[PDB]
Amino acid sequence: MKTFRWKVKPGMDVASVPSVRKVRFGDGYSQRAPAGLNANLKTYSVTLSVPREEATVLESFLEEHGGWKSFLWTPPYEWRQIKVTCAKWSSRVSMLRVEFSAEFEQVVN
Amino acid sequence: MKTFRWKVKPGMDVASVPSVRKVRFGDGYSQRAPAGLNANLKTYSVTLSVPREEATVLESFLEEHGGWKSFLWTPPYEWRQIKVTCAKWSSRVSMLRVEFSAEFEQVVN
Amino acid sequence: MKTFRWKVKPGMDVASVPSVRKVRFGDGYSQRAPAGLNANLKTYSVTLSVPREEATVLESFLEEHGGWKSFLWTPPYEWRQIKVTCAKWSSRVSMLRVEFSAEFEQVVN
Amino acid sequence: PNPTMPVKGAGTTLWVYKGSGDPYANPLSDVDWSRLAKVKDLTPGELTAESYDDSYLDDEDADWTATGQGQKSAGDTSFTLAWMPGEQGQQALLAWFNEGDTRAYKIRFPNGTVDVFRGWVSSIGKAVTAKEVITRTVKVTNVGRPSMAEDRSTVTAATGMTVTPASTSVVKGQSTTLTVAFQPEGVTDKSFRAVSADKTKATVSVSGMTITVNGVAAGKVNIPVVSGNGEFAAVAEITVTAS
Amino acid sequence: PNPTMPVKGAGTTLWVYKGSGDPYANPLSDVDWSRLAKVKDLTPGELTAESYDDSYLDDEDADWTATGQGQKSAGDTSFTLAWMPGEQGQQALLAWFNEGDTRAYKIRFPNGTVDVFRGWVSSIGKAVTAKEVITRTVKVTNVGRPSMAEDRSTVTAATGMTVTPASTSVVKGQSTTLTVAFQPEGVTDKSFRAVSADKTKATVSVSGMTITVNGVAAGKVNIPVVSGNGEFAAVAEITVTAS
Question: Residues D135, D141, D143, CA angle at the centre, nearest 5°?
Answer without folding.
Answer: 150
